[PDB]
Scaffold this active site. Structure first.
Site, PDB file in Angstrom:
ATOM      1  N   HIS A   1       0.651  -1.288   0.400  1.00  0.00           N
ATOM      2  CA  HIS A   1      -0.349  -0.119  -0.066  1.00  0.00           C
ATOM      3  C   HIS A   1       0.637   1.204  -0.208  1.00  0.00           C
ATOM      4  O   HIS A   1       1.356   2.127   1.263  1.00  0.00           O
ATOM      5  CB  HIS A   1      -0.711  -0.393   1.352  1.00  0.00           C
ATOM      6  CG  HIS A   1      -1.809   1.168   0.877  1.00  0.00           C
ATOM      7  ND1 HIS A   1      -1.595   2.095   1.568  1.00  0.00           N
ATOM      8  CD2 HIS A   1      -3.486   1.178   1.383  1.00  0.00           C
ATOM      9  CE1 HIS A   1      -2.448   2.870   2.573  1.00  0.00           C
ATOM     10  NE2 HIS A   1      -3.911   2.787   1.652  1.00  0.00           N
TER      11      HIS A   1
ATOM     12  N   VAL B   1       2.952   3.949   1.902  1.00  0.00           N
ATOM     13  CA  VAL B   1       1.909   4.559   2.986  1.00  0.00           C
ATOM     14  C   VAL B   1       0.824   4.057   3.648  1.00  0.00           C
ATOM     15  O   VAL B   1       0.369   2.893   3.750  1.00  0.00           O
ATOM     16  CB  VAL B   1       1.252   5.856   1.932  1.00  0.00           C
ATOM     17  CG1 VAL B   1       0.914   5.376   1.323  1.00  0.00           C
ATOM     18  CG2 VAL B   1       0.163   6.719   3.479  1.00  0.00           C
TER      19      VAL B   1
ATOM     20  N   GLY C   1      -4.994   4.786   6.267  1.00  0.00           N
ATOM     21  CA  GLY C   1      -5.443   5.610   7.266  1.00  0.00           C
ATOM     22  C   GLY C   1      -6.849   5.114   7.640  1.00  0.00           C
ATOM     23  O   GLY C   1      -6.854   4.067   8.178  1.00  0.00           O
ATOM     24  N   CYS C   2      -7.346   3.480   6.330  1.00  0.00           N
ATOM     25  CA  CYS C   2      -7.851   3.431   7.458  1.00  0.00           C
ATOM     26  C   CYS C   2      -7.642   1.933   9.478  1.00  0.00           C
ATOM     27  O   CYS C   2      -8.463   1.576   9.501  1.00  0.00           O
ATOM     28  CB  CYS C   2      -9.003   1.780   5.856  1.00  0.00           C
ATOM     29  SG  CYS C   2      -7.364   0.455   5.998  1.00  0.00           S
TER      30      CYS C   2
ATOM     31  N   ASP D   1      -8.858   2.460  12.520  1.00  0.00           N
ATOM     32  CA  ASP D   1      -9.389   1.320  12.889  1.00  0.00           C
ATOM     33  C   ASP D   1      -8.921   0.841  14.869  1.00  0.00           C
ATOM     34  O   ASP D   1      -9.773   0.579  15.213  1.00  0.00           O
ATOM     35  CB  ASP D   1      -9.087  -0.019  12.553  1.00  0.00           C
ATOM     36  CG  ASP D   1      -9.355  -1.360  12.665  1.00  0.00           C
ATOM     37  OD1 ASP D   1     -10.948  -1.163  12.590  1.00  0.00           O
ATOM     38  OD2 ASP D   1      -8.809  -2.335  12.869  1.00  0.00           O
TER      39      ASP D   1
HETATM   40  O1  LIG Z   1     -14.617  -4.184  12.136  1.00  0.00           O
HETATM   41  C1  LIG Z   1     -15.538  -3.628  13.298  1.00  0.00           C
HETATM   42  O2  LIG Z   1     -15.570  -3.453  14.154  1.00  0.00           O
HETATM   43  C2  LIG Z   1     -16.988  -3.151  12.216  1.00  0.00           C
HETATM   44  C3  LIG Z   1     -16.818  -4.464  11.452  1.00  0.00           C
HETATM   45  C4  LIG Z   1     -19.010  -4.577  11.379  1.00  0.00           C
HETATM   46  C5  LIG Z   1     -19.711  -4.736  12.368  1.00  0.00           C
HETATM   47  C6  LIG Z   1     -20.996  -5.424  13.125  1.00  0.00           C
HETATM   48  O3  LIG Z   1     -20.098  -6.370  12.634  1.00  0.00           O
HETATM   49  C7  LIG Z   1     -21.787  -4.700  13.386  1.00  0.00           C
HETATM   50  C8  LIG Z   1     -22.724  -2.984  13.521  1.00  0.00           C
HETATM   51  C9  LIG Z   1     -23.606  -2.445  14.300  1.00  0.00           C
HETATM   52  C10 LIG Z   1     -24.330  -4.222  14.601  1.00  0.00           C
HETATM   53  C11 LIG Z   1     -23.879  -5.407  14.142  1.00  0.00           C
HETATM   54  C12 LIG Z   1     -22.795  -5.714  13.541  1.00  0.00           C
HETATM   55  O1  LIG Z   2      -4.847   5.514   3.616  1.00  0.00           O
HETATM   56  C1  LIG Z   2      -5.078   6.359   2.963  1.00  0.00           C
HETATM   57  O2  LIG Z   2      -5.548   6.669   1.554  1.00  0.00           O
HETATM   58  C2  LIG Z   2      -5.105   7.404   3.812  1.00  0.00           C
HETATM   59  C3  LIG Z   2      -3.328   7.850   4.068  1.00  0.00           C
HETATM   60  C4  LIG Z   2      -3.242   9.464   4.884  1.00  0.00           C
HETATM   61  C5  LIG Z   2      -3.958  10.698   4.498  1.00  0.00           C
HETATM   62  C6  LIG Z   2      -2.186  11.086   3.657  1.00  0.00           C
HETATM   63  O3  LIG Z   2      -1.678  10.068   3.229  1.00  0.00           O
HETATM   64  C7  LIG Z   2      -2.477  12.465   2.910  1.00  0.00           C
HETATM   65  C8  LIG Z   2      -3.197  13.024   3.558  1.00  0.00           C
HETATM   66  C9  LIG Z   2      -3.433  14.217   2.669  1.00  0.00           C
HETATM   67  C10 LIG Z   2      -2.936  14.946   1.897  1.00  0.00           C
HETATM   68  C11 LIG Z   2      -1.752  14.134   2.034  1.00  0.00           C
HETATM   69  C12 LIG Z   2      -1.267  12.872   2.269  1.00  0.00           C
END
Ligand SMILES: O=C(O)CCCCC(=O)c1ccccc1
Ligand SMILES: O=C(O)CCCCC(=O)c1ccccc1
Lengths: 173, 172
Positions: B74, B80, B83-84, B88
């Site tokens: 990535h 990089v 961001g996700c 998390d």
């Molecule tokens: O990765 C996470 O943590 C989000 C996973 C999916 C969300 C989820 O399982 C859920 C959310 C609201 C109600 C029932 C299930």
């Molecule tokens: O995973 C992604 O796609 C987001 C990565 C982090 C955000 C980022 O690299 C950035 C944001 C604004 C300006 C320059 C860099």
């Protein structure tokens, strides 16, 4: 803009792998993530004047099986696809669309307005669907897209995201 | 509530690995993700009723090195941190706090309000910091935490998240 885009309405897994290597759009375009960060197997539809705002529609799919890497580590004894990775798939698709239109540079997610998770992807699912409806596409000067998206599992909406934002940047140093 | 919690103000890498295996809080409590989904090396401080709203505070750190798996994929040629995954980490920490207070069940993120990414984590960075300021904790009937979060890299704020939401569920 980038002239090298192999621009088609749908893409296969091999196309997505080529994108990860920078081949699908060429050197000037944004690659998808590769390997364990690629969250799709295929893009089933891309239409430039489509979707709920006539600004773009993208739909993609991920095939689910119990051995996908994220199930074993999230969580031990309770496998569930990380919602963050379904969110990322939507960011991935927004950036891909910008590159598909010839946008130059590397993709970076800029954020999202709101995300709601109401269900989960379990190892017994078969298909995750991503739907992206663009609301603004800026293709001049500083390339950036804003879209709403949903994630479905076997036909049922489980995640919604509003105001997904992604930019392309020729230089990120 | 869950009386099994090994409750301390800070946790080491080994503690976080124990959490992934269900050991740190015991059977009734929410485990952290393991391995490639664990986005922190240590929890440096947890404060009940601390933070900007006096409803709870957590701070954690991730050490950066070029071998972290996400850099190599990535993106190819352009590493990089996703961001996700920093987002998390913040959800992870909200759920961990609920379990730390004795909440029972498995963690699930419920969503987030506005998230802004303004910078990046590159492989030559040293340390990512996550700071979680709780705004509400509901520990009865339907366990839920709501918090704001910040991610910094080497002391520079790069991500903000408003209204992170996580629930605990005994039956999923
Ligand atoms: O990765 C996470 O943590 C989000 C996973 C999916 C969300 C989820 O399982 C859920 C959310 C609201 C109600 C029932 C299930
Ligand atoms: O995973 C992604 O796609 C987001 C990565 C982090 C955000 C980022 O690299 C950035 C944001 C604004 C300006 C320059 C860099």
């Amino acid at each position: 803009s980038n002239a090298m885009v192999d621009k088609r309405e749908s893409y296969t897994k091999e196309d997505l792998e080529a994108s990860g290597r920078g081949e699908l759009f060429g050197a000037g375009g944004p690659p998808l993530p590769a390997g364990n960060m690629l969250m799709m197997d295929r893009i089933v539809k891309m239409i430039e004047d489509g979707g709920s705002h006539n600004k773009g529609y993208v739909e993609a799919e991920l095939d689910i099986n119990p051995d996908l890497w994220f199930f074993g580590c999230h969580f031990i004894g309770d496998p569930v696809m990380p919602g963050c990775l379904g969110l990322d798939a939507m960011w991935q698709l927004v950036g891909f669309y910008l590159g598909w239109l010839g946008g130059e540079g590397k993709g970076r997610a800029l954020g999202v307005g709101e995300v709601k998770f109401t269900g989960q992807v379990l190892p017994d699912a078969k298909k995750v669907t991503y739907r992206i409806n663009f609301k603004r596409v800026i293709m001049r000067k500083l390339i950036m897209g804003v879209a709403d998206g949903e994630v479905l599992v076997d036909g049922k909406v489980i995640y919604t995201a509003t105001d997904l934002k992604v930019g392309l940047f020729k230089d990120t140093n």
